[PDB]
Swiss-Prot record, chains A, B:
Disulfide bonds: 62-147, 99-106, 99-108
Gene: LGB
Protein name per Swiss-Prot or TrEMBL: Beta-lactoglobulin
CDD domains for this protein: lipocalin_beta-LG-like (cd19416)
Subcellular location, principal: secreted
Oligomer status and interactors: Under physiological conditions beta-lactoglobulin exists as an equilibrium mixture of monomeric and dimeric forms. Interaction with LMBR1L which mediates the endocytosis of LGB has been observed in PubMed:17991420, but not in PubMed:23964685.
Processing and modification events after translation: Alternate disulfide bonds occur in equal amounts in all variants examined.
SUPFAM superfamilies: Lipocalins
Length: 149, 149
């Protein structure tokens, strides 16, 4: 991944996000509800490390989860306990494109449970470079459900 | 779906095809190997009805399958025993875009086990109109395996 947000102010990504679309390099990273990269972002809490609240389906349950992405020399790049989180683009107010890699998955996050075509076309343009083999998107009804059910 | 091949000569789609990419309106139509619209086209045999040889994963097996799409008043539209098959576009030599609907799934077929970007971008342009929520694509290795394993 060769796209990163110049001048990312991590404080300003704080609060509520919705996983509107997801893509991955391999189908099995996203194909089932229990697929490894099938994580739904709930809330981003910058400490300047980054606390992520996400939902994730495990052994027949939607589980609420709290993880820390440690900051790096680069403001737009964080690490996870192996896995690099890259923030590609964000306008802070409406959307945020990020990828994670050790296997590569990218997401289009939005502030509100709505379908944002402006954001999805930025997401699409940003995956054109990447070797993605699965893409998903969720309707507003699924954005309000635990684990996008 | 509002895109159909003008002047389709069905005889000329005869022979060998590879399911290079697939999209569907609902994730559960494509997400597992046993998902309903997760069918891999092997061979198209026009009689002028259309005989399809496809592969389909059922109860832990890749099953070879033979079905008939009955012709309609419209050359580019066929029916299946409920389900409409629409041929959107084909150059006969390299690629063929088709959709099926009762739930909507579209595929980008190619003559050879290779990744055709020209064809995938035509596929992408053709799904821009459609309310797709899952897309898959397969590498050349998977195109040569039973059920794209
Ligand atoms: C801008 C920051 C975006 C947020 C990035 C979220 C990435 C977190 C995903 C990491 C996967 C860890 C999930 C739990 C581990 C597991 O169940 O195996
Ligand atoms: C240009 C023609 C393209 C070929 C169209 C192929 C569509 C066939 C898919 C129909 C699904 C039927 C599969 C078996 C039925 C089942 O297992 O439920």
């Amino acid at each position: 991944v060769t796209q990163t947000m110049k001048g990312l102010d991590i404080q300003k990504v704080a609060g509520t996000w919705y996983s509107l679309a997801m893509a991955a390099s391999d189908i099995s990273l996203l194909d089932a509800q229990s697929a490894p990269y099938r994580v739904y972002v709930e809330e981003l809490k910058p400490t300047g490390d980054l606390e992520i609240l996400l939902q994730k389906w495990e052994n027949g349950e939607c589980a609420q989860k709290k993880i820390i992405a440690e900051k790096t020399k680069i403001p737009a790049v964080f690490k996870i306990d192996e896995n690099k989180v890259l923030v590609l683009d964000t306008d802070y107010k409406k959307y945020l494109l990020f990828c994670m890699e050790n296997s590569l998955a990218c997401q289009c996050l939005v502030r509100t449970p709505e379908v944002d075509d402006e954001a999805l076309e930025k997401f699409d343009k940003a995956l054109k470079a990447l070797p993605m083999h699965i893409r998903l998107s969720f309707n507003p009804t699924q954005l309000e459900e635990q684990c996008h059910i």
